[PDB]
Amino acid sequence: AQSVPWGISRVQAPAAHNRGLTGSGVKVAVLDTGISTHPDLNIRGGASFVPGEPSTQDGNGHGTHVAGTIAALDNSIGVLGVAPSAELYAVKVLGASGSGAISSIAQGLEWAGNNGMHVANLSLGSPSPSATLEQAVNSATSRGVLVVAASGNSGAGSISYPARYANAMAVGATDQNNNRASFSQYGAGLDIVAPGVNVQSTYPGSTYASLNGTSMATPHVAGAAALVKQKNPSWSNVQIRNHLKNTATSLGSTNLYGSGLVNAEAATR
């Protein structure tokens, strides 16, 4: 039996699926710890920029979890992604330890722009700015990639890099009450929020696990971006990004929530 995680129904993904929008034909790169083969995922390809882990398989669990929020297959098992038909690419930029070098992350973004990815999911972030990282964000953006990044989990009134950068779409996390999760970074540069507490998804070892974080919120928006892209195949990264913000449900302060909660129903109308 397939279950629909609360976050998926919170962002109203099923409303979009009911109109025929599933992310079909949209290429989404998950820049993380890799993506493990799983019965509820369809991994189209990818690359590893982690020296010492040539494989795109996930030795951590985060990347597989993020992948499932975006595109867990719509079938009779497991869970269901926001964009269950999106074409998923495993871009390994973090090691099994869940940490990685900036250069690996910048190589992953270059790879994304070089391979015609429409969306790049970066559920990672640093409190420090990086010239190298910034340039990779800007380069992928001018190659038509929508870069979606986590705001961070410090609970501070300032957001992480690269989410802070103008060309990154910064995603904060909400709980089941539609309040900002205590750990969710907010402040200047925050674009939007999505579910990030008790998020159930795919996990290595052919199972399912629940995690918390701004990393969990981000894929809901990457997924929402693929739905909009499918509906409006001529739209650019910027057009998609503004539309998502324009159709988000206000939750109160833009300092805390940016545009508000992503809404895939409103975005695909």
The residues binding Ca ion (CB under 5 A) are 2, 40, 72-73, 75, 78, 168, 170, 189
Contact 192, 164 (CB under 8 A): no
Is 266 annotated as a binding-site member? no
Is 191 annotated as a binding-site member? no
Verify whether residue 32 is a known catalytic residue. Answer: yes
Cis peptide, bond prior to residue 51, ω within 30 of zero: no
Task: State which residue, 73 or 181, has the beta carbon closest to Ca ion.
Answer: 73
Contact 184, 217 (CB under 8 A): yes
Is 75 annotated as a binding-site member? yes
Angular region, 159: left φ>0, alpha ψ -120 to 50, beta rest? beta
* Beta carbon of residue 220, minimum distance to Ca ion (angstroms, whole number): 16
Q: Which of 215, 220, 243, 259 does the annotation list as catalytic? A: 215
Is 40 annotated as a binding-site member? yes
Task: State which residue, 50 or 133, has the beta carbon closest to Ca ion.
Answer: 133
Between the alpha carbon of residue 212 and those of residues 31, 58, 113, the distances in Å are: 18, 18, 29
Those residues with Cβ within 8 angstroms of residue 67's Cβ, 6 or more apart along the chain or in another chain = 30, 32, 35, 41, 43, 88, 90, 201, 202, 219
Task: State which residue, 7 or 59, has the beta carbon closest to Ca ion.
Answer: 7
* Beta carbon of residue 122, minimum distance to Ca ion (angstroms, whole number): 12
What is the maximal distance between C-alpha atoms in the chain?
47
Q: Which of 38, 62, 118, 220 does the annotation list as catalytic? A: 62
Active site residues: 32, 62, 215
Residues of each annotated binding site for Ca(2+): 2, 40, 73, 75, 77, 79, 163, 165, 168
